[PDB]
């Protein structure tokens with residue numbers, strides 16, 4: 358890998374933008390979640406602040422490689438999940454919000470980490486390991502909550518899955534080339550995503566049967 362090649366830098370501008378914009382949506386989503394869940398406000402605002410600081414780290418990685426982020430590309434990439442989150446929040450559908458932020462986005466991030474980290478540039482490897490270590494000293498707020506409210510949240514979780522899991526496959530196709538340029542394979546990302554998401558769904562309470570069903574709706 359030539360971290361100074363135009364071709365790397367081109368792909369980085371989109372890929373690093375995605376992580377930057379994702380941290381921004383994470384910050385905003387946690388505040389909206391604090392508002393949907395007033396009894397948990399203090400905790401969620403504390404998480405919001407971590408995600409803002411992490412965004413700064415990722416901004417420094419782009420600066421380190423003299424690349425400016427393609428924020429429009431990043432916004433487009435998140436658009437379908439952003440719009441579904443906003444709609445759900447406006448309807449008070451906190452379960453759907455939590456699926457989007459805490460399952461989909463979360464699992465997408467762990468998988469991205471899992472695939473990116475062995476092929477990262479030094480400066481970014483350091484920053485990213487830092488961020489992930491900090492993240493992993495926490496439990497996943499929405500997984501914990503959904504597990505706690507599983508039986509009553511089950512129908513909305515399935516709708517939310519039907520509506521959002523397909524968007525993930527779209528997101529992955531959009532970055533197949535950039536991922537390859539950065540020595541990350543789409544198939545690898547798909548596999549690791551499905552692993553993190555299945556494991557999260559099982560943890561919150563879904564059966565193997567439910568997981569297979571939720572997966573099948575993932576394919577249309």
Ligand SMILES: CCCCCCCCCC[N+](C)(C)[O-]
Nearest residue numbers: 372373376415418469473481
């Ligand atoms: C699957 C699309 C997202 C993959 C991006 C994962 C790599 C994290 C990169 C963060 N950064 C570019 C600052 O190093």
Ligand SMILES: CCCCCCCCCC[N+](C)(C)[O-]
Nearest residue numbers: 376379380383463465466469
């Ligand atoms: C590369 C796609 C992921 C974008 C980065 C967003 C990370 C926010 C994760 C926050 N979390 C789910 C732990 O609360």
Ligand SMILES: CCCCCCCCCC[N+](C)(C)[O-]
Nearest residue numbers: 466467469470492495496497
């Ligand atoms: C690609 C950079 C993404 C940052 C790492 C993703 C956050 C890990 C989530 C773990 N959690 C906080 C829920 O335990």
